[PDB]
Amino acid sequence: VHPKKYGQGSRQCRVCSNKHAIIRKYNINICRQCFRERADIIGFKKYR
């Protein structure tokens, strides 16, 4: 086992465990496609 603590492969999507394209702002930690689907339930409404 090798240091898995700080890098892209360290953490992942909460939802589908994908190491690519994670929204890491506000500790959301959802890969952006998944976020786009669940943006309604999380309370992210498109206004402008």
Partner RNA sequence: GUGAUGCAUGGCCGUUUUUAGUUCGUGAAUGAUUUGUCUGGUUAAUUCCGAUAACGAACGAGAUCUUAACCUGCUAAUUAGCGGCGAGUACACUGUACUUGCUGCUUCUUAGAGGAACAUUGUGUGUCUAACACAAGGAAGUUUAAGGCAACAACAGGUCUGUGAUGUCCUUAGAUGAACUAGGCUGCACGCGUGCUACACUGAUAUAUAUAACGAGUAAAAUAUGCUUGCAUACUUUUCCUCCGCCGAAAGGCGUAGGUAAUCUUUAUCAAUAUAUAUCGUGAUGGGGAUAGAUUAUUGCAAUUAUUAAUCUUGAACGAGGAAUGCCUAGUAAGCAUGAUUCAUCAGAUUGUGCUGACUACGUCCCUGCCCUUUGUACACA
**Residue 15 within binding range of Zn ion, rule CB under 5 A:** yes
d(CA 3, CA 9): 10
d(CA 9, CA 40): 28
Nearer to other proteins, 17 or 27 (CB): 27
Token pair belonging to 10: 């360290």
**Residue 22 within binding range of Zn ion, rule CB under 5 A:** no
Instruction: State yes or no: 47 annotated in a binding site.
Output: no
Nearer to other proteins, 5 or 48 (CB): 48
Applying CB under 8 A, the residues found at the interface with other proteins are 14, 23, 25-28, 30, 32-33, 35-36, 38-39, 41-48
